[PDB]
Amino acid sequence: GYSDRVRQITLGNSTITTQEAANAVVAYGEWPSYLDDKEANPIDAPTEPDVSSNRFYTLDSVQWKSTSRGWWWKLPDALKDMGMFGQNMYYHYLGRSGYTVHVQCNASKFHQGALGVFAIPEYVMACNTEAKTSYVSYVNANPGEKGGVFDNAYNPSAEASEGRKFAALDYLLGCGVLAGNAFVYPHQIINLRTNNSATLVLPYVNSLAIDCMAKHNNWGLVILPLCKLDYAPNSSTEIPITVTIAPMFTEFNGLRNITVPATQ
């Protein structure tokens, strides 16, 4: 009866079902957990918001077209405006979180295409000016739930001031490595003939027990079309990709007034 294709995930007041899964990945074989006393750093009693924040948040959907080059998000950036998770994140200097990432993309038995879904620790990307190095604005690095897109062309700006964004070049994974090697990162593939969803469970990953969520993204989420969307009756068809992410084992330290980041 039980199947690698059929899964239920419940966190807080939220449940996901899938009937065409392909198992689930636990990044580096490690389930998320709370911070042990023997690895702790800040000494204030932490906030552990539990079900208020540790629940599935669904981002705005994106459209997969035959011409799409791919999509990226950063975490916890993508969830910074999500209910009580966002409030706990911005009221505290420090936060840590694992995640359940659920990527959703259904089609038909007559569609074809394959998405690589990669969870990348410290997903540092190239800037878009050759007048400077490491020259990216906070606003362009932290787009929130809209994330960003890859391009198949690199056109760095004439003026340094116009190039303060990522050069998200697909085949170099936006960071000077070949995209074919992205499989060293925790991943699944959504191959439309096989599966309609990817599930990645991510532990907290950092060189520290806990860090400034508003300064630092622990994970990149990359969705690359490895094989282009094709549908014989309409080559210009679009199918949605929906990203749903639950924080897990969230813990916050250093309560004060709320952080309100710059928007320009």
Partner 1 sequence: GAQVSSQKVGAHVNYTTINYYKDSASNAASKLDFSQDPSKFTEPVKDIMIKTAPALN
Partner 2 sequence: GLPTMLTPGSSQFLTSDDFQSPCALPNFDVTPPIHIPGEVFNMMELAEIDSMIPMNSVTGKANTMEMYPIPLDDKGSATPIFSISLSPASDKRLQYTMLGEILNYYTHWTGSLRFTFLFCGSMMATGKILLSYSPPGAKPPTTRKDAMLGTHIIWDLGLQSSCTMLAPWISNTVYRRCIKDDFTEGGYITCFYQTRIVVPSGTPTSMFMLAFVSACPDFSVRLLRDTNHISQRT
Partner 3 sequence: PTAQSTPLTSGVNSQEVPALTAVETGASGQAVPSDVIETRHVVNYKTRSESTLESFFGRSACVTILEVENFNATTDADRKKQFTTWAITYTDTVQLRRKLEFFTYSRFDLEMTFVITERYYASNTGHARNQVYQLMYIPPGAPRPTAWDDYTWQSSSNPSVFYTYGSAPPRMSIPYVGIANAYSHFYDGFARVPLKDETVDSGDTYYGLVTINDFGTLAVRVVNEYNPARITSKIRVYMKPKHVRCWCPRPPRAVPYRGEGVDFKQDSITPLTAVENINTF
Which residues make up the interface to partner 1 (CB under 8 A)? Answer: 1-6, 22-30, 184, 186, 194, 199, 201
**Window of 8-16, 94-102, 143-151, 219-227 that interacts with Ca ion by CB under 5 A:** 8-16
Q: What residue type is 160 in one-letter code? A: A
* Minimum distance of partner 1 from residue 239's CB (angstroms): 21
What is the spatial distance between Cα 101 and Cα 98, in angstroms, rounded to a whole number?
Answer: 10
Annotated ligand binding at 48? The verdict is yes
What is the spatial distance between Cα 248 and Cα 34, in angstroms, rounded to a whole number?
Answer: 9
Please, which residue, 194 or 235, has the CB nearer to partner 3? Answer: 194
Please, which residue, 17 or 235, has the CB nearer to partner 3? Answer: 17
Residue of the chain from 81, 87, 171, 254 that contacts Cl ion (CB under 5 A): 81
CA atoms within 13 A on the CB side of 241: 29
What is the spatial distance between Cα 210 and Cα 41, in angstroms, rounded to a whole number?
Answer: 8
Please, which residue, 44 or 60, has the CB nearer to Cl ion? Answer: 60
* Minimum distance of Cl ion from residue 36's CB (angstroms): 32
What is the spatial distance between Cα 46 and Cα 44, in angstroms, rounded to a whole number?
Answer: 6
Closest CA to 71 of 222, 180, 173: 222
* Minimum distance of partner 1 from residue 193's CB (angstroms): 11
Annotated binding site for Ca(2+): 48
